[PDB]
């Protein structure tokens, strides 16, 4: 019942996630995006080098996404 209410967004901005993080935390979020993409939990788009990186739901389910997008 508590699980049903944990709604999310249509997309996640990596740069927004990394706002007010330090260099190690930001790198770890970037790296997590790579892992989530390998697991097909997300799709990734980056318009141009060094632009924002946008995650959207992938074709595989994934648990604990409210942890990874925090």
């Amino acid at each position: 019942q508590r699980a049903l209410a944990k709604t999310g967004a249509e997309s996640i901005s990596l740069l927004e996630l990394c706002r007010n993080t330090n260099r190690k935390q930001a790198a770890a979020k970037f790296y997590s995006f790579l892992v989530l993409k390998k697991q097909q939990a997300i799709e990734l788009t980056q318009e141009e080098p060094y632009s924002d990186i946008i995650a959207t739901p992938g074709p595989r389910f994934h648990g604990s996404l409210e942890v990874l997008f925090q």
Binding site: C18, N22, R23, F30, Y31, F33, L34, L44, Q46, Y50
Partner: protein, 358 residues
Amino acid sequence: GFLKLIEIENFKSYKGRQIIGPFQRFTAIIGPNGSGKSNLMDAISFVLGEKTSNLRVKTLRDLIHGAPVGKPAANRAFVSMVYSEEGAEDRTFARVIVGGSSEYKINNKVVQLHEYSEELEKLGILIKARNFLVFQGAVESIAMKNPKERTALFEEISRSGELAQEYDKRKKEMGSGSLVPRSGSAKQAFEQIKKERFDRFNACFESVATNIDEIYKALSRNSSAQAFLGPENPEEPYLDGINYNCVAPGKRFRPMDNLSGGEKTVAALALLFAIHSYKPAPFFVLDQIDAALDNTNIGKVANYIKEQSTCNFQAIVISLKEEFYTKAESLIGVYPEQGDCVISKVLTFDLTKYPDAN
């Protein structure tokens, strides 16, 4: 100058045309377990003139995306390097696979392999000595190699090896190989090629040997550290081995082979960077050189690179360790995409926007 970016098209797992970079002065390539990082190492080696025999394939066409499952994605593939230098237009070095054969190009004009290699040499990229690229699992061997193999590297870089044939001929004509070697003219002709080979070799060796101690001190950040390069044969250094010995920082002298993997790594990087003081390469590509380093030595190597990447050389590292790669200015992250063959693609991330603190 510096490596501004790599452009890759249908090369091993890099399907389609992809921009790799742009690189900063200190960039790390990272990502989860997969083939993409090693394929990017191979792409760099490829465009910088590596032979197909060393790129993990039987035939050149096997480098085209899709060849591992019998269905190549294209009749062609390429890797391209954009080389930038202050006060000059960008120069593009490309190696293209066409018809199962390699075509070389500088600014989209075709050249033969000889001119390609010659032009890279004038930028400090020696495609035979290959002193700008360190492969995964290979960094320690630079410090631990056979002394005679170190001499070979110095003979290649110094071009003293170009004289070895004439040397051997004059030595025999002087009586080498006879029971009792005995002539004023042949002695002079052998003394003359000996001096020429000696002078070429020494111009490289003396430079490296006189800079290695300061570099080894600067890497292990310690006055107690010492590094020595010395020839087994001082009168004819090119004839025998070049000995490499170090005193680890604050520790007591142990004969190198007793050093830890980490200590061997630092000694190997000092040698790598001392070679750079004689014939500087514009960039280094370092594949997992942090594998045996503890966190203290990771900090010291990254600090050396950072203070050196401010226009002495550019550093492109592949790393599995966040302690190392979080010290880079930007990250290139490699990730896979599902397909008939696995596909590699990349993302770019600027770390300089975040404080490296708390």
